[PDB]
Structures are given as structure tokens and as C-alpha cells.
Design a protein around this ligand. Structure first.
Ligand code: 2BA
Ligand code: 2BA
Lengths: 150, 150
């Protein structure tokens, strides 16, 4: 009864960096890379959607193969033309990044609509991502601790 | 302290049907439908991956636009040829469906690797799906109840 409630206080008031997949371990795209090779790398990494950053590691947005395809068809561009265009042009900006100072309660409410959230500093530096898998793993470790009592 | 632990017992020992998105509300494909229109409907529903069922509502597998594209390129098939082929040929069978009698602990451990799980009966009837969003919403309602005390 007692130890159960405090484990939740220590969970709810815990830091965001406990659940973060650091920027080094996040497959990203530099906004100046060509679109044809991005379509190629996305087929090799296997991720449906990845973050887009600048050379200074500043957050721009996210990209998927769908985004690249929508741009090519909307602009009627050829395959060769795409290999001469950078990602900036077709970058998705719909996902609003979360600050690294964000509460875990604030994470819980946002991660219900997003498979992942990109994490930024106050100066728009890319810090990594919060995935639903990371949060789900944290919930499972917590439940693992309450099955110890009864 | 007291009311906290029982809410978790009632959560952990709860039925799967509390978190299920019933079969009626799941966008599916009938295994005999043409592949070209499936590529079309997948662009209208917006789901990255959906279940594939038979006319008798028996579970077959799942489909995505990637699966359709991989089949067309691997078989070198033309656009018109795809409109004359049914989904059965390119159906993904990697996701193992969960029984409707499955424990919520068993759900927790499986939903960490899968955005969704297709739910089946003992006779392979499709019952619906368990999404990560459904589980994440259930965790949030639970945390909402413990913030009431302190
Ligand atoms: N290489 C792999 N090995 C093992 N399991 C894999 C995997 N690729 C995908 N999955 C599984 O599929 C889920 C959805 O993947 P998706 O690529 O659509 O969606 C992913 C992707 O868009 C992004 N993501 C995850 N890890 C990433 C990373 N290290 N770098 C860049 N983006 C990442 O976050 C979304 C949600 O991720 P999450 O981990 O919660 O959930 C992942 C994970 O459970
Ligand atoms: N039309 C829409 N309206 C609002 N939010 C939307 C949406 N489409 C996608 N999302 C959001 O994106 C998440 C990942 O979507 P995705 O299409 O890749 O992946 C989905 C899709 O493959 C499947 N799914 C969810 N609901 C479905 C349904 N009613 N019929 C068929 N498949 C469904 O389960 C996966 C995980 O679903 P989940 O709900 O946890 O997570 C969803 C949801 O949070």
C-alpha cells in the first residue's frame, strides 16, 4: 500500500532524460542532403518517420517516404530532379517538439497522439526523442515492482 | 496508499475487451479485393498498416502500401496487372494475433514491440485490435485517479 504510491510520485515527478533516446542514437537527416538518397536511407533504417536537423544540430522537422512522394507528385518532378533537391523543401513541420524540461504528465498526454516526440532545448538544439515504446517499457518496470508485494 | 494498489489489481486483472477497438471500427481489407484499390483506400484512411480478413471475417494478416510496393517490384508487375490481383498474394503474416482471452500483462509485454495487435477468437474470428494509444489512455485514466489523493 505505502511503497506503491511513492513509486508513482517518483515516476510522475521524474525527469524527461530518463526516457529519452539521445540524439546520437536517433537516425536523422541533415536538411541539406539530397532527397533521392533520403528515400534510400529510409528503406535501410526501416523507420517510418525520422527527425530533420541542421549542420549545427538545430531541429527543423521530420521526414517519411510519403512526404518525399507527395512533394514529387505535387511538383511533377522527375527522379533525377529529386537527387538535385535538398530535404528542406519537403520537411514535415506538423509535430510540435517538446522542451527537455517537459513534465512526464505532459509527456503522457502528448505521446497518446504521437508514436514519438522530438525533444529540444530552449535554443532549439535537438536532444533526441521520446518514443511510446520507452514510456511503455517504464510502465512495465513499475508494474513489475507492484507484482512483488501481491 | 490502500485504494492505489487495488486500482492496479483491477487494472492488471481486467478483461482485454475493455481496451479493444471492435472489428466494426477497424478499417480492414477483404483478401479477395484488388491491390490497386487497396493502395487507393490506404491513402484515404491514412493508416500505415491495417488487418486483412476473409468474407467469413477470419483473420489472414495485415497490409501496408510498402507490402504492395515490395510485391510489385519483386514480381516486376505492371500497374494494370496489380488491379487484376487480390491482396492474399502480398499479405504480411509477421504479426502474431493475440487471443481474446489474453491477459493485460501479456498485452503490456507484446504492445511494447507492436503499434497494434490483431485480436482473434479460438476459431480464428477477427475480434478487433489493441492499439498502443488505447493502453496509453488507460494508464492516463489510472494516473488521473492517484493525483486525486496526492
Ligand atoms: N529497427 C527496429 N528494431 C526494433 N523494433 C522496431 C524497429 N523499427 C521499428 N520498430 C518497432 O515499431 C514501432 C513503430 O515504428 P515506426 O518506424 O513506425 O516509428 C518509430 C520511428 O518513427 C521513431 N523512432 C524510434 N526509434 C528511432 C530511432 N532510434 N531513430 C529515429 N527514429 C526513431 O519513433 C517511432 C515510434 O517508435 P517506437 O520505438 O515507440 O516503436 C517502434 C518499435 O516498437
Ligand atoms: N485517423 C487518425 N485520427 C487520429 N489519430 C491518428 C489517425 N491515424 C493515425 N493516428 C495516430 O498515429 C498513430 C500511429 O498510426 P499508424 O497509422 O502508423 O498506426 C496505427 C494503424 O496501423 C492501426 N490502427 C489504429 N486505429 C485503427 C483502425 N481504427 N482501423 C485500422 N487500423 C487501425 O494501429 C496503429 C497504432 O495505432 P494508434 O491509435 O495506437 O496510434 C496512432 C494514432 O495515435
Amino acid at each position: 500500500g505505502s511503497q506503491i504510491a511513492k513509486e508513482f510520485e517518483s515516476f510522475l515527478l521524474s525527469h524527461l532524460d530518463h526516457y529519452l533516446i539521445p540524439a546520437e542514437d536517433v537516425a536523422i537527416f541533415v536538411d541539406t542532403h539530397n532527397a533521392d538518397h533520403v528515400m534510400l536511407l529510409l528503406a535501410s533504417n526501416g523507420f517510418s518517420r525520422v527527425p530533420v536537423i541542421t549542420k549545427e544540430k538545430k531541429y527543423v522537422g521530420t521526414i517519411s517516404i510519403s512526404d518525399i512522394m507527395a512533394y514529387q507528385s505535387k511538383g511533377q518532378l522527375t527522379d533525377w530532379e529529386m537527387a538535385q533537391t535538398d530535404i528542406v523543401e519537403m520537411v514535415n513541420t506538423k509535430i510540435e517538439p517538446i522542451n527537455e524540461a517537459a513534465t512526464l504528465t505532459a509527456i503522457m498526454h502528448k505521446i497518446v497522439d504521437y508514436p514519438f516526440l522530438p525533444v529540444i532545448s530552449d535554443q532549439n538544439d535537438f536532444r533526441g526523442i521520446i518514443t511510446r515504446k520507452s514510456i511503455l517499457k517504464a510502465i512495465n518496470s513499475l508494474l513489475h515492482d507492484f507484482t512483488d508485494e501481491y
